[PDB]
Design a protein around this ligand. Structure first.
Ligand SMILES: *[C@@H]1O[C@H](CO)[C@@H](O)[C@H](O)[C@H]1O[C@H]1C[C@](C)(N)[C@H](O)[C@H](C)O1
Ligand SMILES: *[C@@H]1O[C@H](CO)[C@@H](O)[C@H](O)[C@H]1O[C@H]1C[C@](C)(N)[C@H](O)[C@H](C)O1
Ligand SMILES: *[C@@H]1O[C@H](CO)[C@@H](O)[C@H](O)[C@H]1O[C@H]1C[C@](C)(N)[C@H](O)[C@H](C)O1
Ligand SMILES: *[C@@H]1O[C@H](CO)[C@@H](O)[C@H](O)[C@H]1O[C@H]1C[C@](C)(N)[C@H](O)[C@H](C)O1
Ligand code: CL
Ligand code: CL
Ligand code: CL
Ligand code: CL
Ligand code: CL
Ligand code: CL
Lengths: 7, 7, 7, 7
């Protein structure tokens, strides 16, 4: 992971 | 990054 | 930073 | 911590 979102 | 720690 | 993860 | 070194 490590990214974010939210989709 | 974006996480924290400390390890 | 410099550490890693993942949490 | 989080920095390095070495002193
Ligand atoms: C985390 O570090 C290792 C060691 O250098 C790499 O092999 C790996 O690709 C790296 O992970 C990437 C992908 C991730 C977890 N989604 C984050 O983007 C991190 C910062 O980089
Ligand atoms: C990021 O979203 C996940 C779900 O996929 C939550 O479980 C987690 O609480 C959330 O992370 C927080 C803490 C972090 C990783 N240090 C960052 O500040 C993010 C933006 O919010
Ligand atoms: C940083 O030094 C400490 C001692 O104070 C060691 O125990 C540790 O192994 C070392 O950390 C590694 C792993 C890290 C934190 N992801 C970085 O890559 C550093 C440079 O090396
Ligand atoms: C880590 O994040 C918290 C939440 O925002 C701050 O309150 C804290 O000052 C921060 O820690 C600093 C000091 C440290 C651990 N030596 C590193 O430089 C990190 C990135 O920032
Ligand atoms: Cl990943
Ligand atoms: Cl999402
Ligand atoms: Cl750390
Ligand atoms: Cl993480
Ligand atoms: Cl500190
Ligand atoms: Cl040192």
């Amino acid at each position: 992971x490590x990214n974010x979102x939210y989709x």
